[model samples]
Target: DLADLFPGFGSEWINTSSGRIFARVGGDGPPLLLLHGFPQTHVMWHRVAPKLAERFKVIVADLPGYGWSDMPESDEQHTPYTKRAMAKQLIEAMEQLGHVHFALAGHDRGARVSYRLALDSPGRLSKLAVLDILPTYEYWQRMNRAYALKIYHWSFLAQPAPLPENLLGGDPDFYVKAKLASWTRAGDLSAFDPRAVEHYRIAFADPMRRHVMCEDYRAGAYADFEHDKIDVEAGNKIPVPMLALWGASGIAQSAATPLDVWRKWASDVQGAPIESGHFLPEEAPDQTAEALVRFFSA
Candidate 1:
């Protein structure tokens, strides 16, 4: 069972705006929330959450459309999947758990939500950390030949729903497996736990989940991008102290200087490269945990 992925952690089906959100809660200090990225679920943090739990009450949760969480119906605008929507509901979920203010770190898509929350609800986060990604607007702004080739999924997954949904549906397992391998620095699945990989495959195997995945990106392309652009133009930067940790060979670095890019979006920002690939939590769990602990604790 997926519960085995996070030993000793309590399973929580928390209520949010859309519906119940599945999270693994553990640790014993100030509350800390961890969110996973695309093509992955909360289980992606299995390797890092427990360690963080030792110092802070850690809540590793699935974003609305991913993992064990509910897949709410999406609209033509993909509003439900937008980072803004995700952040609002997640704030509700945190309040439900009695945590109005907590530290947060999000990887990939979840990072998008985390930053959006930091920007939209400035007082809620004590600290913010983003893993292996640039802001949505930054990615679109820097989509050069090399970078675009590296992140082709951005456009592919954002295509009109059924097209990518149907193509990926043909062989979801193979698609996930191939993707997992390609995004790693080593170019293989050796960095990931077999059970975790199986869990990801099972989630991607569903037609609805596949559609949600596409909608998530569709939100990224349209709604998310517009939100980011407005903020950039308005010079609205995140107010919290921010830390970015990118894998040495991750997709974020392909954009140029990741730390430099983050500085533009945050008033105070600092980051370092970890020795892994895009999947930092899985590929470099200990290092990821260490960096997170240091950032949030300070």
Candidate 2:
């Protein structure tokens, strides 16, 4: 069933300095890494990943604490779950696959990782494409009552350890289902394939997964933002070309100026809105793939 998402692709559990990474590798050409958003496996890119394989050697990896990968315990600052850790894993996974540099595309939390990697290792990325998210610092600056109302999990999930983990673990399916339904343009689960839904349900239903997910948010709320602020203060713009895509019907577009904010953080940045919701890869795969191919190939 899982193989159906990436037909003919090779799967492996690659060991890294941090942990073993579960990933699917396929296609031939320049390497391209596709990272999924919160509460999802790499299966989120099932609709677009194979097509991308035509022009890229696509690598779809489960984040350390998500999917089938190992979940390292969070430290005091949640460093293990921080974007920096996630970004380091991304690079090492690619290096293990023999690619020193590659194009990277990500959505939601994955997009956050992409930017962190680009900022931290400025010369290592050939191109960067961030879908449906803005920089963490700008996001915090723009946070308002409306954003907090619509995306309450940003605060709720980041609360002191065990609180969010315990609450969500009581009925993990309900929390994941509710998140998928509410964060979409259709405001329902129909946008997601039933197969992928099962994949997510199985991964997220684990209490360990619930705990790490909260740690991810905890890092986002505090440590990650501190790193982002330092970069902006030091004028660390992503040296490579950057593409920013947001769901036209999603929260960020209505809440802030995405492209404008990106322009401030990168030397060359350009992108527009997609006609879906927060889950751009699942909700608008073709449009997302088209944008990535056009941007990364150039």
Candidate 3:
């Protein structure tokens, strides 16, 4: 029934040089793009985007190989599944949709993509918000045993071969449910509701989606770090106002030094910790949405 709420909110499939992407657009005013996290699709922002749409033009997109988008054809293109490539594709997609300049907000994997967008296309984004993540290079440099163990999928999924894909496809639901159960603070997978969980399950059931996911992680491990290093070395900083929100109970890097890390790449940087877990939007939608609205408005 939720899917039927918007009669004309149909998806627009755009073919980019990297891959085909699916996006849904609504609302009016300055365009705002919402990117979702891993193991999830554009539907992750189903609650937040519509609310923001009331005031700003909202665009929610399914990354390549996720949701209703086309999948990668081979390992060659798979290398481009990194957040950098996805960010470029998103910019192109938005341009195709007649949005030359826009704001961006993202969570988890989406947040990672937003970081690259802010860096590579600093002039395009009017404002930027990143939820529940640190810069990719910072994360890798500070990883510890406990953190590494908890986020094992970063390595497992990034493997070059199809071993992870083959194994996960055996029982996609099991893998999806297990991932949700393990990544949360209270192990309350039901917090997302059955339909929400089922939506993710549908996205993961496709083998191509699974592979793209793996490739995304692989890109993080191999390419994203280097990309960040180059940016840092070149003294590249995001010129727009940036708001980086993190969950108090989630695994956020440099929580004590958020401003420091952010200031390194943003002339105007501000951040706060939300009283929730990794799934801040779903776990504390009101707080998260209110904070974002206030920050972006400011």
Candidate 4:
């Protein structure tokens, strides 16, 4: 099914000191990297990557442990998989692959990573796009009872020790699918392709995969906030053009507020909300792709 869109594309392994990373690269022209979210691999871009590949070099990577990449050996080593660390690794990986500078777009967990990348390596990115997330600090400050209850995974997965991992490992597919299914408003859970759901099921089944996800949220609540504070204190702001896309119905944050928030971080920032949910790229590829192409081309 994906072959038609991603013809001539192949996967390659990048051996970093921390671990081996898996990625798919295709298309031509200026580089554009697409990073996937939790419970998903580079496959989240299955629909949009090919379309964007037609116009630019599309590089999609499976974040460490989430897909075809090697998992960290222990929770201590999982530090490298955190958003800030992963952003640095991805930048280095791209440099090794011969791209010094590129446009980047990330969804969900990928967006969090992209956020750190923009702050850490402002010069290496020509433009940035983040889907369905707010600045971590802002999110925590604004979270309320209704919000917390609706997006319970944030706290559930952020807990320390064995509880989160233990529960997730017992039936990873069920937990992952339940999370994915809950974010949508569709009455029929089958509105999404069964193949896509099964793909997520397979990816989340690995123990290391589950751990990576738990650590992502855990690091966000603890470590990432400290990093964000440092960045803010350093007067960091994204110097390049940026696009912040959001789904109106998603729990990440208020889509209406991104423009204002992004403006605080970038001199030139623009964005809008798509009439979809958290998985905007897959749920509404044409609209999301059109927005991205226009943003990059602009």
Candidate 5:
């Protein structure tokens, strides 16, 4: 039933050294990888990918730990979930699908991975777009709780091993639902389709999935930020054309204009606010798709 969500996209798993990534590959022309954020799956792109697919081949995948992907055991450094690892596998996934160099776009957590991929494998991407997130180092350097932002996940989920995992496992749906609801402008789950939200709910309740999701933050807090710190210290910036779109009414708009924050990390940056919340692709699908098309095509 849910497979129908992506229409004509073909679904399957791709083998990566770290894990089996679930992906839906379809469309024609140059390849593009669409990555989703925390607590969601590749289906998060259901609204945007199809539109973008008309002009370019699109490869939408569940990050190693998210969606139907196989969750690997974590090491002390949380390398399996680090954006460095996440970004590497996505690049390999695209190459396996026959696109050595293609456009890339990521939303939220996925956006974090995209920028990481940009810095690590700059030559592999034709264009890069980050949705609703600043660079990890930038975010850490300016972490705050302005207007009661819901960044507790950064610390709470990143706690050592079983701590946050056990807590989330007890009532996973509650936490996932809370994230989706509160991140919106209206503070409710009205922005998402019931089918997609159901996938998130069911996926969250899987014990293994819950723990792996926690590792995402564990890595973000430890490894990802550490990587960013070194890169920023080296004055590294993405030489590729970059775009940063944020929800005009989302938490980032309250914290720092996303474009303003992104300008600090990218060489050729261009973006503005969409009339929505954190889930820009779903909350503002048409706008998100059009913005992507314009950016990727240019």
Candidate 6:
């Protein structure tokens, strides 16, 4: 139904361990996988994906439990929702599509998944680029009062199911819009396409979707953080080249130098701040695509 935004891209439902993942594949050249972030779906990449498609075979997919993807079952440790689980299933989906190795670019929560994949299976990625995020361990260690206030959802949404989920469901539209406006540099929704916002609204309107998203945060706060902590301690750096990009006014920018923090976890890391807010691919698609193109093309 949202295919209009994607032009020539064709949809496919790939079976993964999590469930059926909805992906739109198009273009040519080496494969490139684009993953979306929290509070949004693969629809977030509409502005930039088509452009990237001109040079690469682009596969824009919704992370498990988001968008058209099946809602996966959850567990006590949020194991099913962990980035580790998500990454593995995604690689499985890619292999099903015939790409044994590919380049990746992920935004927001999807960025979390991308780095996990790079660290866990370094040989699988030709190049890795993360948009608007720091590793999970870095965020937990740096949760100062100011930063906590900025990203309170990291704690709020991670609370036991049906609590934060119930509150957000009370008015999904207001909750989604408020978060989007506050995160953007302009402090408004002008940067987002009304249509895309509607799709995001549709996803949040579902109670199951809200709960799964909460589970995602819970996984991030617990398991994902522990995984990163262990890797940091063991000096398990990402073997492939990594590109880190953040919106100048995005949450990651408020923590530490984006590139510097990434360098600690990656053998080779490079990035810069774009003149936008949290949603780089939406707010500053041209710049975001330019960075990804230059980095992946190399």
| Candidates by lDDT, descending order | 1, 6, 2, 5, 4, 3
Model 5: runs farther than 4 Å from truth?
Answer: 1-3, 145-149
lDDT of 3 by residue, 1-298 (tens): 3353333455678777767788887888888888888888887776676677777788888876677777665465355677787788889888887887888998888888898988988878889998888888877776688767867787788777678888888898899888876666677686575677777887888777887788888888878788888888898888889898887776574333555777887888888888777777777777788877887665
lDDT of 1 by residue, 1-298 (tens): 5437999899999997698889999989999999999889999999999889989999999999898898878999998899999999899999999999999999999999999999999899999999998999999988788767888899999999689988998889999899889989999999999999988988888889889989999999999999999999999999899999999999798647899999999999989999999999999999999999998887
Q: Which ranges of candidate 3 are over 4 A from the true structure?
A: 1-10, 74-77, 253-257
Clashes of each: 0, 0, 0, 0, 0, 0
Off by more than 4 A, model 2:
1-3
In candidate 2, the residue pairs with backbone N, CA or C atoms under 3 Å apart (3 or more residues apart, or in different chains) clash, namely: none
Q: At residue 210, what lDDT does model 6 achieve?
A: 84
Question: TM-score of predicted model 3?
Answer: 0.92
Over 152-268, each residue of candidate 2 has an lDDT whose tens digit, in order, gives 898999999789988998889988988887888999999999888888988888888888889999999999999999998999898879999999887578767789889998999
The TM-score between candidate 6 and the true structure equals 0.98
TM-scores of all predicted structures: 0.98, 0.97, 0.92, 0.93, 0.96, 0.98
Clash count (model 4, backbone only): 0
Show the colliding residue pairs in model 4. none
After superposition, which runs of candidate 4 have C-alpha atoms over 4 Å from their true positions?
1-5, 74-78, 187-191, 253-256
Deviating ranges (above 4 Å) for candidate 6: 1-3
Candidate 1's TM-score reads: 0.98
The candidate that achieves the highest lDDT relative to the unseen native structure: 1
Tens-digit lDDT track of model 5 for 1-298: 4545788999868887777889888898888889998889888899999998898888888988899888878889989889999988877777667778989899888999999999999999899998888887776777776432457788888889799988887778899999998887667998898898988888887888888888888888889999999888898889889988899876566667778777777889999889988899889999999999999986
Candidate 4, residues 2-61: lDDT per residue as tens digits? 332345667879776667778888888889989988777787787788778888888888
lDDT of 5: 0.85
